[PDB]
Amino acid sequence: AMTITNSKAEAWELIGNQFWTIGRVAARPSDRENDIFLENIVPGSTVAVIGASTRFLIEKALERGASVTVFDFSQRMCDDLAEALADRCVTIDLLDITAEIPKELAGHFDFVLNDRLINRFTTEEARRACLGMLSLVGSGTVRASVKLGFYDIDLKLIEYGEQSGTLAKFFDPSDKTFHFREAGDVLDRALVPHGLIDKPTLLEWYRRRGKETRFDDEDVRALLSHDVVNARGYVTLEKAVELPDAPNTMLYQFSRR
Ligand SMILES: C[S@@+](CC[C@H](N)C(=O)[O-])C[C@H]1O[C@@H](n2cnc3c(N)ncnc32)[C@H](O)[C@@H]1O
């Protein structure tokens, strides 16, 4: 019942294992990218993955010898993941990274990884999230990739919502936040192929997904330097790398010590 405080979790009850079985292939890290997420991580390391959907990244983490805990705010996601890994030794917990971290977990991980999870946030949600990741790692490293600029669907959203003159109703240009459930009829028209998941399932997933903010590189930097994220010590961006396969996707490694 943390789905009361965060109704976005409802969006992922809809999807479950479909995300990595029939979802858009490019919407998860490639083999190479799993490897980049994991560099200099060695057997024995404690690693937290936020997003139980990143099933193959989690599986390379375990194969590498790391002690992996997965966090996700959706019960089905946890359940389908625990099913796919029933033979492996791994901890899977129900948690909302934008909620305040349980004290029993502060500074408990060497690494916190997530792939394009920040894209599932609004700006104030993403600020809270980054704080949570930092809270988890204590003096460890956070590696978080972010997809930059607009999604293909965004381009249909602008177009088909301009012609309709509804664009301002569901898109805020101040920080580039979309409200999908509020484009109404435009959403249906703009939907693009996400692997082999069908239109009814997409539409609903989008509608349940709430608001989402789009980021440019300057936007991710502004987020990381924001007072809310530095409220408990100052943050350091150690590096930022443009990923090979994924779509204009920058991976950011940061910490606060
Ligand atoms: C990893 S992110 C998006 C990128 C894509 N799913 C991937 O694996 O590359 C989506 C996953 O994170 C989870 N998630 C989204 N928002 C969350 C939040 N606020 N707290 C915890 N988990 C969240 C969702 O349940 C979903 O499993």
Side-chain angles (χ1 to χ4, degrees), residues 12 19 27 51 53-54 72-73 95-97 115-117 121:
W12 303 84
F19 190 85
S53 72
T54 333
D72 202 290
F73 76 167
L95 176 153
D96 174 348
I97 201 85
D115 182 37
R116 281 171 281 175
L117 165 63
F121 305 141

Side-chain angles (χ1 to χ4, degrees), residues 172-190:
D172 178 351
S174 77
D175 65 338
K176 310 170 277 180
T177 308
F178 284 105
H179 203 159
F180 309 110
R181 183 180 200 287
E182 284 268 30
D185 178 67
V186 181
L187 192 54
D188 305 37
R189 194 147 119 248

Side-chain angles (χ1 to χ4, degrees), residues 116-205:
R116 281 171 281 175
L117 165 63
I118 280 152
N119 283 109
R120 293 326 132 224
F121 305 141
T122 61
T123 310
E124 64 95 3
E125 267 198 306
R127 294 166 187 157
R128 281 190 285 121
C130 294
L131 201 44
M133 298 168 202
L134 279 178
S135 177
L136 290 179
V137 297
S139 57
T141 308
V142 174
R143 298 177 173 174
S145 66
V146 189
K147 212 221 82 70
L148 308 166
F150 294 116
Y151 284 78
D152 291 342
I153 183 172
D154 288 346
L155 301 173
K156 307 261 73 176
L157 281 174
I158 314 307
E159 169 174 338
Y160 299 168
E162 199 85 77
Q163 287 175 0
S164 199
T166 34
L167 182 60
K169 176 185 161 50
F170 68 76
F171 172 72
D172 178 351
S174 77
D175 65 338
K176 310 170 277 180
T177 308
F178 284 105
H179 203 159
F180 309 110
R181 183 180 200 287
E182 284 268 30
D185 178 67
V186 181
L187 192 54
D188 305 37
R189 194 147 119 248
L191 279 180
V192 302
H194 194 285
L196 320 170
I197 309 164
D198 55 44
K199 265 47 204 169
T201 304
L202 288 180
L203 188 74
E204 191 57 23
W205 189 43

Side-chain angles (χ1 to χ4, degrees), residues 4 11 28 37-38 40 43 85 104 108 111 117 122 126 153-154 176 178 217 219 226-227 230 232 238 243 249-250:
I4 317 176
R28 60 159 169 288
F37 260 107
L38 288 178
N40 298 353
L85 300 169
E104 25 287 302
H108 203 264
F111 297 94
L117 165 63
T122 61
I153 183 172
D154 288 346
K176 310 170 277 180
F178 284 105
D217 180 60
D219 291 324
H226 192 279
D227 302 329
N230 290 268
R232 308 208 265 252
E238 298 170 20
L243 286 183
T249 283
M250 186 101 54

